[PDB]
Amino acid sequence: IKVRENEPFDVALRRFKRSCEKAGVLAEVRRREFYEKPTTERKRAKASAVK
Amino acid sequence: RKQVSDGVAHIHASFNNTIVTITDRQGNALGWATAGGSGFRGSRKSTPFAAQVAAERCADAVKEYGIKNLEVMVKGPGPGRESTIRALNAAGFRITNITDVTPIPHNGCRPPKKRRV
Amino acid sequence: RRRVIGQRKILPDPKFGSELLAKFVNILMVDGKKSTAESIVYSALETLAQRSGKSELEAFEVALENVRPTVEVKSRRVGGSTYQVPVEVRPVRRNALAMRWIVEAARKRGDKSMALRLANELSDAAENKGTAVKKREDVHRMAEANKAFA
Amino acid sequence: EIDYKDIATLKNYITESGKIVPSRITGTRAKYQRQLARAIKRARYLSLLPYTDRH
RNA sequence: AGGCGGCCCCCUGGACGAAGACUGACGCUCAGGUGCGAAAGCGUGGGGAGCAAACAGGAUUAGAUACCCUGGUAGUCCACGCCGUAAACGAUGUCGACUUGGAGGUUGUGCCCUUGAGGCGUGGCUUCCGGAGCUAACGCGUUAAGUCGACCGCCUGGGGA
RNA sequence: ACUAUGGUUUUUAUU
Protein backbone atom coordinates (compact mmCIF):
# COMPACT_ATOMS: atom_id res chain seq x y z
CA ILE A 1 0.00 0.00 0.00
CA LYS A 2 -0.55 2.93 -1.47
CA VAL A 3 -4.01 4.62 -0.92
CA ARG A 4 -3.97 8.46 -1.42
CA GLU A 5 -3.95 10.85 1.62
CA ASN A 6 -7.22 12.64 2.60
CA GLU A 7 -6.08 14.24 5.97
CA PRO A 8 -2.83 16.29 5.86
CA PHE A 9 -0.09 15.36 8.43
CA ASP A 10 3.70 15.68 7.84
CA VAL A 11 4.56 12.65 10.13
CA ALA A 12 3.17 9.12 9.58
CA LEU A 13 1.09 7.15 12.12
CA ARG A 14 2.44 3.63 11.08
CA ARG A 15 -1.29 2.80 10.89
CA PHE A 16 -1.62 1.69 7.20
CA LYS A 17 1.85 0.23 6.19
CA ARG A 18 3.60 -3.06 7.32
CA SER A 19 1.27 -3.28 10.39
CA CYS A 20 -1.13 -3.88 8.15
CA GLU A 21 -0.53 -7.07 6.04
CA LYS A 22 3.23 -7.67 6.77
CA ALA A 23 2.40 -8.53 9.55
CA GLY A 24 -1.37 -8.08 10.27
CA VAL A 25 -3.38 -10.85 8.40
CA LEU A 26 -4.58 -14.43 9.10
CA ALA A 27 -2.91 -14.63 12.62
CA GLU A 28 -5.62 -13.14 14.99
CA VAL A 29 -8.93 -13.46 12.99
CA ARG A 30 -11.51 -16.07 14.20
CA ARG A 31 -10.38 -18.05 17.35
CA ARG A 32 -6.65 -18.18 16.35
CA GLU A 33 -4.58 -18.59 19.60
CA PHE A 34 -7.52 -17.29 21.76
CA TYR A 35 -7.22 -18.39 25.47
CA GLU A 36 -7.74 -14.76 26.73
CA LYS A 37 -5.04 -12.65 25.03
CA PRO A 38 -6.59 -11.29 21.70
CA THR A 39 -10.05 -10.41 23.25
CA THR A 40 -10.66 -10.78 27.04
CA GLU A 41 -7.31 -9.18 28.10
CA ARG A 42 -8.20 -6.23 25.73
CA LYS A 43 -11.73 -6.00 27.25
CA ARG A 44 -9.81 -5.54 30.58
CA ALA A 45 -7.58 -2.84 29.01
CA LYS A 46 -8.79 0.61 30.22
CA ALA A 47 -9.12 3.48 27.68
CA SER A 48 -9.61 7.27 28.37
CA ALA A 49 -11.02 7.68 24.83
CA VAL A 50 -13.12 5.22 22.75
CA LYS A 51 -12.05 2.52 21.53
CA ARG B 1 2.67 51.15 2.06
CA LYS B 2 4.66 50.05 5.23
CA GLN B 3 7.95 49.24 3.32
CA VAL B 4 9.01 46.47 5.85
CA SER B 5 10.47 44.06 3.12
CA ASP B 6 8.43 41.45 5.06
CA GLY B 7 5.09 39.63 4.36
CA VAL B 8 2.99 36.42 4.47
CA ALA B 9 2.27 33.66 1.87
CA HIS B 10 -1.05 31.73 2.00
CA ILE B 11 -1.32 28.38 0.12
CA HIS B 12 -4.46 26.24 -0.49
CA ALA B 13 -3.99 22.82 -2.22
CA SER B 14 -7.01 20.82 -3.54
CA PHE B 15 -7.42 17.49 -5.47
CA ASN B 16 -7.38 19.47 -8.82
CA ASN B 17 -5.89 22.96 -8.22
CA THR B 18 -3.51 24.93 -5.94
CA ILE B 19 -3.94 28.63 -4.91
CA VAL B 20 -1.03 30.92 -3.90
CA THR B 21 -1.65 34.43 -2.40
CA ILE B 22 1.09 36.86 -1.20
CA THR B 23 -0.02 39.55 1.30
CA ASP B 24 1.31 42.44 3.41
CA ARG B 25 0.56 42.52 7.21
CA GLN B 26 -1.48 45.73 6.56
CA GLY B 27 -4.05 43.50 4.67
CA ASN B 28 -2.88 44.44 1.11
CA ALA B 29 -2.84 41.25 -1.02
CA LEU B 30 0.15 42.13 -3.26
CA GLY B 31 -0.43 39.32 -5.84
CA TRP B 32 -2.14 35.95 -6.40
CA ALA B 33 -1.80 32.99 -8.82
CA THR B 34 -3.16 29.43 -9.42
CA ALA B 35 -2.12 26.24 -11.25
CA GLY B 36 -5.30 26.85 -13.37
CA GLY B 37 -4.08 30.28 -14.63
CA SER B 38 -0.79 28.53 -15.64
CA GLY B 39 -2.82 26.57 -18.31
CA PHE B 40 -2.78 23.10 -16.61
CA ARG B 41 -5.64 20.52 -16.50
CA GLY B 42 -6.66 17.42 -14.50
CA SER B 43 -4.16 15.44 -12.33
CA ARG B 44 -1.15 17.39 -13.76
CA LYS B 45 -2.73 20.70 -12.51
CA SER B 46 -2.74 19.18 -8.96
CA THR B 47 1.07 18.44 -8.95
CA PRO B 48 3.75 20.00 -6.66
CA PHE B 49 5.37 21.26 -9.94
CA ALA B 50 2.13 23.04 -10.99
CA ALA B 51 2.01 24.62 -7.47
CA GLN B 52 5.73 25.56 -7.60
CA VAL B 53 5.46 27.31 -11.04
CA ALA B 54 2.30 29.12 -9.85
CA ALA B 55 4.38 30.40 -6.88
CA GLU B 56 7.35 31.26 -9.21
CA ARG B 57 4.90 33.24 -11.47
CA CYS B 58 3.55 34.98 -8.31
CA ALA B 59 7.14 35.78 -7.12
CA ASP B 60 7.53 37.22 -10.67
CA ALA B 61 4.32 39.34 -10.01
CA VAL B 62 5.68 40.95 -6.73
CA LYS B 63 9.16 41.67 -8.23
CA GLU B 64 8.65 45.50 -8.09
CA TYR B 65 6.85 45.53 -4.65
CA GLY B 66 10.13 45.72 -2.60
CA ILE B 67 9.73 42.44 -0.55
CA LYS B 68 12.52 39.96 0.43
CA ASN B 69 11.25 37.73 3.33
CA LEU B 70 8.09 35.57 3.66
CA GLU B 71 6.42 33.44 6.34
CA VAL B 72 4.37 30.54 4.90
CA MET B 73 0.91 29.26 5.94
CA VAL B 74 -0.17 25.91 4.35
CA LYS B 75 -3.77 24.72 3.92
CA GLY B 76 -5.80 22.06 2.01
CA PRO B 77 -5.58 18.18 1.87
CA GLY B 78 -4.24 17.95 -1.76
CA PRO B 79 -0.75 17.19 -3.16
CA GLY B 80 1.58 20.18 -3.85
CA ARG B 81 0.91 22.07 -0.51
CA GLU B 82 4.60 22.62 0.55
CA SER B 83 6.71 22.90 -2.69
CA THR B 84 6.66 26.78 -2.41
CA ILE B 85 10.03 26.71 -0.53
CA ARG B 86 11.60 25.63 -3.90
CA ALA B 87 9.87 28.62 -5.59
CA LEU B 88 11.27 30.99 -2.90
CA ASN B 89 14.75 29.47 -3.52
CA ALA B 90 14.22 29.94 -7.32
CA ALA B 91 13.20 33.64 -6.82
CA GLY B 92 15.99 34.43 -4.20
CA PHE B 93 13.56 35.01 -1.26
CA ARG B 94 14.34 34.40 2.44
CA ILE B 95 12.00 32.26 4.55
CA THR B 96 10.92 32.40 8.21
CA ASN B 97 8.92 29.17 8.64
CA ILE B 98 6.20 26.86 7.20
CA THR B 99 3.12 26.67 9.48
CA ASP B 100 0.15 24.35 8.96
CA VAL B 101 -3.24 26.12 9.41
CA THR B 102 -5.50 23.03 8.95
CA PRO B 103 -9.07 23.66 10.23
CA ILE B 104 -11.20 20.99 12.00
CA PRO B 105 -12.24 18.17 9.52
CA HIS B 106 -16.00 18.96 9.38
CA ASN B 107 -18.42 17.07 7.03
CA GLY B 108 -16.11 14.14 5.95
CA CYS B 109 -17.60 12.98 2.61
CA ARG B 110 -15.93 10.00 0.75
CA PRO B 111 -12.66 9.31 2.67
CA PRO B 112 -10.87 6.19 1.22
CA LYS B 113 -12.96 3.14 2.37
CA LYS B 114 -10.26 0.50 1.50
CA ARG B 115 -9.62 -2.06 4.30
CA ARG B 116 -9.91 -1.11 7.54
CA VAL B 117 -8.19 -2.94 10.49
CA ARG C 1 36.54 -2.49 -8.29
CA ARG C 2 37.27 -2.14 -12.11
CA ARG C 3 35.58 1.39 -12.29
CA VAL C 4 35.80 1.66 -16.19
CA ILE C 5 36.85 5.37 -16.04
CA GLY C 6 40.20 7.30 -16.15
CA GLN C 7 38.89 9.80 -13.49
CA ARG C 8 40.84 12.89 -14.73
CA LYS C 9 41.29 15.50 -12.95
CA ILE C 10 44.18 17.21 -14.77
CA LEU C 11 46.42 20.31 -14.40
CA PRO C 12 45.39 23.70 -16.03
CA ASP C 13 47.05 25.20 -19.15
CA PRO C 14 50.69 26.38 -18.51
CA LYS C 15 50.13 29.78 -20.39
CA PHE C 16 46.39 30.50 -19.74
CA GLY C 17 45.91 29.23 -16.09
CA SER C 18 42.51 27.74 -17.17
CA GLU C 19 41.35 24.13 -16.71
CA LEU C 20 38.61 24.57 -19.39
CA LEU C 21 41.27 25.05 -22.12
CA ALA C 22 43.32 22.02 -20.86
CA LYS C 23 40.15 19.87 -21.43
CA PHE C 24 39.02 21.53 -24.74
CA VAL C 25 42.38 21.09 -26.60
CA ASN C 26 41.31 17.38 -26.57
CA ILE C 27 38.25 18.04 -28.88
CA LEU C 28 38.64 17.06 -32.59
CA MET C 29 42.36 16.32 -31.87
CA VAL C 30 43.39 12.64 -32.43
CA ASP C 31 45.95 10.20 -30.98
CA GLY C 32 47.40 12.85 -28.54
CA LYS C 33 49.49 14.81 -31.17
CA LYS C 34 48.75 18.13 -29.29
CA SER C 35 52.23 19.65 -30.03
CA THR C 36 52.04 19.04 -33.88
CA ALA C 37 48.20 19.31 -34.33
CA GLU C 38 48.67 23.06 -35.28
CA SER C 39 45.78 22.70 -37.84
CA ILE C 40 43.21 22.34 -34.96
CA VAL C 41 44.65 22.93 -31.40
CA TYR C 42 43.59 26.44 -30.13
CA SER C 43 42.86 27.50 -33.79
CA ALA C 44 39.05 27.80 -33.25
CA LEU C 45 39.87 31.21 -31.60
CA GLU C 46 41.66 32.27 -34.87
CA THR C 47 38.83 31.16 -37.25
CA LEU C 48 35.96 32.72 -35.18
CA ALA C 49 36.69 35.90 -37.26
CA GLN C 50 34.89 33.92 -40.11
CA ARG C 51 31.97 32.48 -37.98
CA SER C 52 28.91 33.95 -36.21
CA GLY C 53 30.04 33.51 -32.50
CA LYS C 54 31.42 36.47 -30.43
CA SER C 55 34.26 37.33 -27.97
CA GLU C 56 36.68 34.44 -28.81
CA LEU C 57 38.48 34.51 -25.35
CA GLU C 58 35.16 33.38 -23.70
CA ALA C 59 33.42 31.64 -26.68
CA PHE C 60 33.97 28.12 -25.13
CA GLU C 61 32.89 29.31 -21.63
CA VAL C 62 29.61 30.73 -23.07
CA ALA C 63 29.07 27.67 -25.34
CA LEU C 64 29.48 25.30 -22.33
CA GLU C 65 27.22 27.59 -20.17
CA ASN C 66 24.39 27.07 -22.76
CA VAL C 67 24.49 23.18 -23.27
CA ARG C 68 25.04 21.50 -19.81
CA PRO C 69 22.34 19.32 -18.15
CA THR C 70 21.00 20.13 -14.62
CA VAL C 71 19.31 16.76 -13.76
CA GLU C 72 19.26 12.99 -14.30
CA VAL C 73 16.11 10.83 -13.94
CA LYS C 74 16.52 7.74 -11.69
CA SER C 75 13.77 5.12 -11.09
CA ARG C 76 13.20 3.72 -7.56
CA ARG C 77 11.14 0.57 -8.29
CA VAL C 78 9.36 -0.89 -5.18
CA GLY C 79 6.12 -2.56 -6.47
CA GLY C 80 5.36 -0.02 -8.04
CA SER C 81 5.25 3.03 -7.52
CA THR C 82 8.16 3.22 -10.04
CA TYR C 83 9.38 6.70 -8.90
CA GLN C 84 10.89 8.26 -12.11
CA VAL C 85 12.36 11.05 -9.89
CA PRO C 86 14.79 13.71 -11.27
CA VAL C 87 17.90 14.54 -9.16
CA GLU C 88 20.54 17.25 -9.80
CA VAL C 89 23.91 16.44 -11.42
CA ARG C 90 27.13 17.00 -9.42
CA PRO C 91 29.52 19.96 -10.06
CA VAL C 92 32.16 17.97 -12.11
CA ARG C 93 29.89 15.33 -13.79
CA ARG C 94 27.74 18.23 -15.23
CA ASN C 95 30.63 18.73 -17.72
CA ALA C 96 31.41 15.01 -18.42
CA LEU C 97 27.75 14.53 -19.53
CA ALA C 98 28.54 17.09 -22.35
CA MET C 99 31.95 15.58 -23.46
CA ARG C 100 30.52 13.46 -26.38
CA TRP C 101 28.43 16.28 -28.03
CA ILE C 102 29.26 19.31 -30.32
CA VAL C 103 31.28 17.19 -32.90
CA GLU C 104 28.38 14.97 -34.14
CA ALA C 105 28.13 16.91 -37.49
CA ALA C 106 31.87 17.79 -37.75
CA ARG C 107 33.61 14.31 -37.95
CA LYS C 108 31.69 13.54 -40.51
CA ARG C 109 31.61 16.84 -42.57
CA GLY C 110 34.25 16.78 -45.41
CA ASP C 111 35.77 19.95 -46.97
CA LYS C 112 38.90 19.81 -44.63
CA SER C 113 39.64 23.05 -42.56
CA MET C 114 39.27 21.44 -39.07
CA ALA C 115 39.80 24.75 -37.14
CA LEU C 116 37.13 26.62 -39.17
CA ARG C 117 34.85 23.56 -38.77
CA LEU C 118 35.21 23.66 -34.95
CA ALA C 119 34.51 27.47 -34.98
CA ASN C 120 31.27 26.71 -36.93
CA GLU C 121 30.03 24.31 -34.19
CA LEU C 122 31.35 26.70 -31.44
CA SER C 123 28.86 29.25 -32.95
CA ASP C 124 25.94 26.78 -33.54
CA ALA C 125 25.99 24.91 -30.17
CA ALA C 126 26.06 28.26 -28.24
CA GLU C 127 22.40 29.03 -29.29
CA ASN C 128 20.99 26.94 -26.34
CA LYS C 129 18.58 25.47 -28.99
CA GLY C 130 18.34 22.74 -31.67
CA THR C 131 21.83 21.23 -32.21
CA ALA C 132 24.06 19.97 -29.34
CA VAL C 133 20.95 20.14 -27.00
CA LYS C 134 18.81 17.30 -28.60
CA LYS C 135 19.53 15.06 -25.53
CA ARG C 136 19.19 18.04 -23.07
CA GLU C 137 15.63 18.54 -24.46
CA ASP C 138 15.19 14.72 -24.02
CA VAL C 139 16.05 15.03 -20.25
CA HIS C 140 13.44 17.86 -20.19
CA ARG C 141 10.97 15.33 -21.73
CA MET C 142 11.92 12.60 -19.18
CA ALA C 143 11.40 15.22 -16.38
CA GLU C 144 7.66 15.32 -17.42
CA ALA C 145 7.25 11.64 -16.33
CA ASN C 146 7.23 12.01 -12.48
CA LYS C 147 3.99 14.15 -12.90
CA ALA C 148 2.13 10.87 -13.58
CA PHE C 149 1.92 10.15 -9.77
CA ALA C 150 -1.13 12.47 -9.25
CA GLU D 1 -32.14 12.68 23.72
CA ILE D 2 -33.24 14.20 27.12
CA ASP D 3 -32.37 18.00 26.92
CA TYR D 4 -32.04 20.97 24.49
CA LYS D 5 -32.37 24.12 26.75
CA ASP D 6 -29.18 24.12 28.90
CA ILE D 7 -26.55 24.98 26.23
CA ALA D 8 -23.40 24.56 28.46
CA THR D 9 -23.14 20.90 27.20
CA LEU D 10 -23.96 21.67 23.52
CA LYS D 11 -21.21 24.34 23.18
CA ASN D 12 -18.71 21.48 23.96
CA TYR D 13 -19.51 19.83 20.52
CA ILE D 14 -19.50 22.94 18.17
CA THR D 15 -16.74 25.39 17.11
CA GLU D 16 -16.58 29.22 17.35
CA SER D 17 -17.94 28.98 13.70
CA GLY D 18 -20.96 26.98 15.04
CA LYS D 19 -19.91 23.80 13.04
CA ILE D 20 -20.25 20.27 14.52
CA VAL D 21 -17.03 18.53 15.78
CA PRO D 22 -16.60 14.84 14.59
CA SER D 23 -16.87 11.98 17.21
CA ARG D 24 -13.55 10.53 15.87
CA ILE D 25 -11.66 13.59 17.36
CA THR D 26 -13.54 14.14 20.73
CA GLY D 27 -13.36 10.60 22.28
CA THR D 28 -17.20 10.48 21.87
CA ARG D 29 -19.31 7.50 20.60
CA ALA D 30 -21.31 7.81 17.31
CA LYS D 31 -24.65 6.61 18.84
CA TYR D 32 -24.23 9.69 21.14
CA GLN D 33 -23.07 11.96 18.23
CA ARG D 34 -26.24 11.07 16.18
CA GLN D 35 -28.41 12.49 19.07
CA LEU D 36 -26.04 15.32 20.17
CA ALA D 37 -26.66 16.54 16.59
CA ARG D 38 -30.44 16.32 17.37
CA ALA D 39 -29.92 18.34 20.61
CA ILE D 40 -27.95 20.95 18.58
CA LYS D 41 -30.76 21.01 15.91
CA ARG D 42 -33.36 21.51 18.73
CA ALA D 43 -31.25 24.36 20.24
CA ARG D 44 -30.80 26.00 16.74
CA TYR D 45 -34.60 26.02 16.31
CA LEU D 46 -34.78 27.58 19.85
CA SER D 47 -32.54 30.43 18.42
CA LEU D 48 -30.04 29.93 21.34
CA LEU D 49 -27.35 28.32 19.06
CA PRO D 50 -26.30 29.59 15.57
CA TYR D 51 -27.28 27.70 12.34
CA THR D 52 -24.54 29.17 10.10
CA ASP D 53 -22.08 32.11 10.41
CA ARG D 54 -23.53 34.06 7.39
CA HIS D 55 -25.82 35.09 9.56
C1' A E 1 -41.10 -7.28 -0.81
C1' G E 2 -39.75 -3.26 -4.55
C1' G E 3 -37.36 -0.49 -1.04
C1' C E 4 -36.83 3.23 3.32
C1' G E 5 -31.82 8.65 6.13
C1' G E 6 -32.14 17.08 7.80
C1' C E 7 -35.07 18.66 12.30
C1' C E 8 -40.59 18.65 14.20
C1' C E 9 -46.01 16.92 15.35
C1' C E 10 -50.11 13.33 14.89
C1' C E 11 -51.90 8.37 13.16
C1' U E 12 -50.39 3.13 12.12
C1' G E 13 -49.18 -3.28 10.74
C1' G E 14 -45.50 -6.46 13.20
C1' A E 15 -41.37 -7.81 16.94
C1' C E 16 -39.96 -7.86 22.58
C1' G E 17 -39.61 -7.18 28.58
C1' A E 18 -43.11 -8.64 32.50
C1' A E 19 -47.02 -9.81 36.76
C1' G E 20 -51.94 -11.39 36.94
C1' A E 21 -56.59 -12.93 35.11
C1' C E 22 -59.94 -14.88 30.52
C1' U E 23 -61.00 -17.92 25.86
C1' G E 24 -60.79 -23.11 24.88
C1' A E 25 -58.60 -26.23 18.57
C1' C E 26 -60.84 -20.54 17.29
C1' G E 27 -55.43 -24.02 13.42
C1' C E 28 -52.99 -24.36 8.09
C1' U E 29 -52.70 -24.36 2.63
C1' C E 30 -54.92 -22.68 -1.92
C1' A E 31 -56.99 -23.63 -8.46
C1' G E 32 -60.22 -19.38 -9.77
C1' G E 33 -60.36 -14.30 -7.86
C1' U E 34 -58.04 -9.99 -5.61
C1' G E 35 -54.02 -6.32 -3.23
C1' C E 36 -49.08 -3.80 -4.75
C1' G E 37 -43.61 -0.81 -8.88
C1' A E 38 -36.90 -0.21 -8.72
C1' A E 39 -37.64 1.14 -13.83
C1' A E 40 -39.26 2.91 -18.53
C1' G E 41 -44.19 3.30 -21.49
C1' C E 42 -49.91 5.96 -21.61
C1' G E 43 -51.17 11.44 -20.87
C1' U E 44 -53.58 16.88 -19.54
C1' G E 45 -51.47 20.97 -17.02
C1' G E 46 -46.98 22.95 -13.86
C1' G E 47 -41.40 22.47 -13.02
C1' G E 48 -36.36 22.13 -14.94
C1' A E 49 -30.71 23.34 -11.18
C1' G E 50 -28.01 17.68 -11.02
C1' C E 51 -27.59 13.66 -14.70
C1' A E 52 -29.30 12.07 -19.29
C1' A E 53 -31.15 7.93 -23.71
C1' A E 54 -33.26 11.04 -28.34
C1' C E 55 -30.69 15.11 -30.73
C1' A E 56 -27.63 19.75 -33.15
C1' G E 57 -22.35 19.66 -33.17
C1' G E 58 -17.00 18.63 -32.07
C1' A E 59 -14.74 14.93 -33.45
C1' U E 60 -12.74 9.93 -34.34
C1' U E 61 -10.79 7.20 -38.30
C1' A E 62 -9.41 4.31 -43.60
C1' G E 63 -14.85 4.83 -41.59
C1' A E 64 -18.75 6.15 -37.17
C1' U E 65 -24.24 6.67 -36.99
C1' A E 66 -20.04 4.89 -31.26
C1' C E 67 -15.57 5.51 -26.85
C1' C E 68 -13.98 11.04 -25.62
C1' C E 69 -16.01 16.63 -25.13
C1' U E 70 -19.30 21.68 -25.39
C1' G E 71 -24.82 22.15 -25.44
C1' G E 72 -29.23 19.02 -24.58
C1' U E 73 -35.12 16.49 -25.17
C1' A E 74 -37.82 12.31 -23.39
C1' G E 75 -37.42 11.06 -18.27
C1' U E 76 -36.15 11.36 -13.21
C1' C E 77 -39.84 15.94 -9.84
C1' C E 78 -45.60 17.72 -8.73
C1' A E 79 -51.45 16.74 -8.80
C1' C E 80 -54.48 12.36 -10.62
C1' G E 81 -55.36 7.94 -12.93
C1' C E 82 -53.85 3.29 -16.55
C1' C E 83 -49.60 -0.11 -17.32
C1' G E 84 -48.09 -4.18 -14.06
C1' U E 85 -41.90 -4.79 -15.73
C1' A E 86 -36.70 -6.78 -14.02
C1' A E 87 -31.21 -10.86 -12.65
C1' A E 88 -38.65 -9.09 -9.01
C1' C E 89 -30.76 -12.68 -6.93
C1' G E 90 -31.70 -13.52 -0.17
C1' A E 91 -29.97 -19.02 -6.25
C1' U E 92 -33.98 -21.50 -1.37
C1' G E 93 -42.91 -22.07 -2.13
C1' U E 94 -46.28 -21.47 2.27
C1' C E 95 -47.20 -23.70 6.91
C1' G E 96 -45.68 -27.60 11.56
C1' A E 97 -42.37 -29.77 15.13
C1' C E 98 -36.79 -31.22 15.96
C1' U E 99 -31.35 -31.02 15.72
C1' U E 100 -25.42 -28.86 17.39
C1' G E 101 -20.75 -25.81 19.12
C1' G E 102 -18.14 -20.99 18.94
C1' A E 103 -17.97 -15.53 18.23
C1' G E 104 -19.51 -10.52 17.13
C1' G E 105 -23.36 -6.73 16.35
C1' U E 106 -28.35 -4.87 17.78
C1' U E 107 -32.55 -4.50 21.66
C1' G E 108 -34.87 -5.78 26.38
C1' U E 109 -33.84 -7.85 31.53
C1' G E 110 -31.06 -9.48 36.63
C1' C E 111 -26.77 -7.80 39.32
C1' C E 112 -22.24 -4.53 38.90
C1' C E 113 -19.11 0.99 44.50
C1' U E 114 -20.10 -0.51 35.42
C1' U E 115 -11.58 -2.07 33.38
C1' G E 116 -17.14 -1.36 30.61
C1' A E 117 -18.25 2.17 22.21
C1' G E 118 -20.25 -2.29 28.33
C1' G E 119 -19.29 -7.22 31.98
C1' C E 120 -21.42 -12.20 33.30
C1' G E 121 -26.16 -15.15 32.63
C1' U E 122 -31.14 -15.14 30.01
C1' G E 123 -35.43 -13.84 25.95
C1' G E 124 -35.99 -11.58 20.38
C1' C E 125 -33.38 -10.50 15.69
C1' U E 126 -29.08 -11.37 12.74
C1' U E 127 -23.91 -12.13 10.55
C1' C E 128 -19.25 -15.05 10.10
C1' C E 129 -16.73 -19.56 11.36
C1' G E 130 -17.91 -24.73 12.08
C1' G E 131 -20.18 -30.28 13.50
C1' A E 132 -24.47 -34.37 12.26
C1' G E 133 -27.05 -35.14 7.70
C1' C E 134 -27.54 -34.00 2.37
C1' U E 135 -24.73 -32.66 -2.46
C1' A E 136 -21.18 -34.13 -8.73
C1' A E 137 -19.41 -29.24 -6.99
C1' C E 138 -20.27 -24.50 -4.47
C1' G E 139 -21.13 -25.79 0.00
C1' C E 140 -26.33 -25.46 2.74
C1' G E 141 -25.04 -25.51 7.86
C1' U E 142 -31.00 -24.71 13.49
C1' U E 143 -33.16 -18.23 9.75
C1' A E 144 -30.22 -25.26 6.24
C1' A E 145 -29.46 -27.53 0.04
C1' G E 146 -30.69 -31.42 7.05
C1' U E 147 -35.29 -34.56 9.38
C1' C E 148 -39.73 -35.46 7.37
C1' G E 149 -45.43 -34.23 8.41
C1' A E 150 -50.02 -30.59 5.64
C1' C E 151 -51.37 -28.03 0.96
C1' C E 152 -50.34 -25.67 -3.61
C1' G E 153 -47.54 -24.60 -8.29
C1' C E 154 -44.72 -27.47 -12.04
C1' C E 155 -41.84 -31.67 -14.60
C1' U E 156 -39.80 -36.30 -17.79
C1' G E 157 -32.82 -35.71 -23.87
C1' G E 158 -31.21 -30.74 -26.66
C1' G E 159 -32.63 -27.20 -30.45
C1' G E 160 -37.39 -25.66 -32.62
C1' A E 161 -40.36 -22.10 -28.56
C1' A F 1 -2.12 4.07 -7.28
C1' C F 2 3.78 6.03 -11.12
C1' U F 3 1.83 8.81 -17.85
C1' A F 4 -3.57 6.57 -24.86
C1' U F 5 -4.73 4.52 -29.48
C1' G F 6 -9.00 1.46 -32.74
C1' G F 7 -9.59 -3.46 -38.21
C1' U F 8 -8.17 -7.64 -41.14
C1' U F 9 -9.93 -12.61 -38.06
C1' U F 10 -5.19 -20.73 -41.82
C1' U F 11 -6.44 -24.39 -46.39
C1' U F 12 -5.22 -29.58 -47.45
C1' A F 13 -2.32 -32.21 -42.56
C1' U F 14 -5.41 -36.66 -39.25
C1' U F 15 -2.95 -42.32 -43.68
Side-chain angles (χ1 to χ4, degrees), chain C residues 21-134:
Chain C
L21 182 61
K23 292 190 177 184
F24 272 82
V25 294
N26 193 28
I27 306 302
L28 209 70
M29 181 284 302
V30 295
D31 79 94
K33 298 200 175 93
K34 55 68 159 174
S35 71
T36 56
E38 297 178 298
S39 305
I40 181 58
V41 175
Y42 197 103
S43 299
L45 278 69
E46 306 189 305
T47 54
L48 203 69
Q50 293 177 255
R51 294 296 182 263
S52 52
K54 292 183 179 176
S55 314
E56 78 296 295
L57 85 178
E58 298 193 304
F60 279 101
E61 185 182 277
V62 178
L64 187 63
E65 186 176 271
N66 286 266
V67 301
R68 288 179 296 205
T70 56
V71 302
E72 177 172 68
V73 183
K74 178 166 187 177
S75 284
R76 197 183 78 240
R77 291 179 69 86
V78 294
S81 310
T82 56
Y83 288 107
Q84 291 184 99
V85 175
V87 61
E88 286 170 87
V89 298
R90 291 218 306 159
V92 184
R93 187 173 179 239
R94 69 190 286 255
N95 307 283
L97 291 167
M99 183 60 182
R100 186 61 60 174
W101 305 339
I102 308 173
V103 302
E104 301 191 284
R107 284 172 69 273
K108 215 173 186 172
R109 188 60 260 198
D111 204 35
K112 59 178 172 295
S113 305
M114 289 291 193
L116 185 63
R117 199 189 297 171
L118 185 58
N120 188 84
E121 309 307 290
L122 186 59
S123 305
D124 181 46
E127 297 184 308
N128 208 321
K129 188 165 184 181
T131 51
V133 296
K134 292 182 181 173

Side-chain angles (χ1 to χ4, degrees), chain A:
Chain A
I1 226 58
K2 310 184 281 180
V3 178
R4 303 187 186 275
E5 298 300 299
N6 182 62
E7 290 169 282
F9 290 103
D10 81 304
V11 177
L13 195 56
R14 297 192 178 190
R15 190 174 174 89
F16 224 66
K17 288 165 183 174
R18 287 253 171 179
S19 68
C20 285
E21 197 161 74
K22 290 182 177 177
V25 293
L26 304 175
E28 180 169 293
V29 191
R30 63 168 183 242
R31 304 295 89 188
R32 286 179 172 97
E33 301 190 296
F34 178 48
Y35 166 46
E36 60 178 21
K37 299 181 177 182
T39 51
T40 324
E41 279 279 283
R42 300 187 189 153
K43 281 279 173 165
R44 293 193 297 259
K46 178 171 178 175
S48 307
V50 294
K51 202 179 178 178

Side-chain angles (χ1 to χ4, degrees), chain D residues 10-21:
Chain D
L10 306 183
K11 277 180 173 273
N12 196 29
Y13 303 96
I14 61 172
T15 64
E16 70 193 301
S17 300
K19 299 191 187 192
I20 305 177
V21 188

